[PDB]
C-alpha cells in the first residue's frame, strides 16, 4: 500500500517528543492524518504517520489547505 491523499492532514511545524506512550511523536516535516476530531481531550487529534498511532496536539501542526498546482515562472 503506502498510499495517501490530501484532505485533513497536518504538518508538524515544530518538533515534539511524546512523553506518554499514548501520545504521538512529531518531527519537523511529518505529515499526520486527522481521523477523529473529538474523543478524549479538546484540541488533541488522532492521526497516524510513520507507522505510529496515538494522540498529538493540533497546535504544534499546521492544517494544510489549498495547494497551488499549475504554477509557472
Swiss-Prot record:
Post-translational note: Phosphorylated on tyrosine residues in response to FGR activation.
Tissue: Widely expressed.
SH3 domain mapped to chain residues: 8-66
Coiled-coil ranges from the UniProt annotation: none
Disulfide bonds: none
TM annotation in the entry: none
Signal peptide feature range: none
Summary of the function given for this chain in its UniProt record: Guanine nucleotide exchange factor for the Rho family of Ras-related GTPases. Plays an important role in angiogenesis. Its recruitment by phosphorylated EPHA2 is critical for EFNA1-induced RAC1 GTPase activation and vascular endothelial cell migration and assembly.
Self-association and partners: Interacts (via SH2 domains) with the phosphorylated form of EPHA2. Interacts with SSX2IP. Interacts with NEK3 and PRLR and this interaction is prolactin-dependent.
Protein name (Swiss-Prot/TrEMBL): Guanine nucleotide exchange factor VAV2
This protein's encoding gene: VAV2
Amino acid at each position: 500500500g503506502s498510499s495517501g491523499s490530501s484532505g485533513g492532514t497536518a504538518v508538524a511545524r515544530y518538533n515534539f517528543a511524546a512523553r506518554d506512550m499514548r501520545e504521538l511523536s512529531l518531527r519537523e516535516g511529518d505529515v499526520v492524518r486527522i481521523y477523529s476530531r473529538i474523543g478524549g481531550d479538546q484540541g488533541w487529534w488522532k492521526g497516524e504517520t510513520n507507522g505510529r498511532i496515538g494522540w498529538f496536539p493540533s497546535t504544534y501542526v499546521e492544517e494544510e489547505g489549498i495547494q497551488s498546482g499549475p504554477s509557472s515562472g
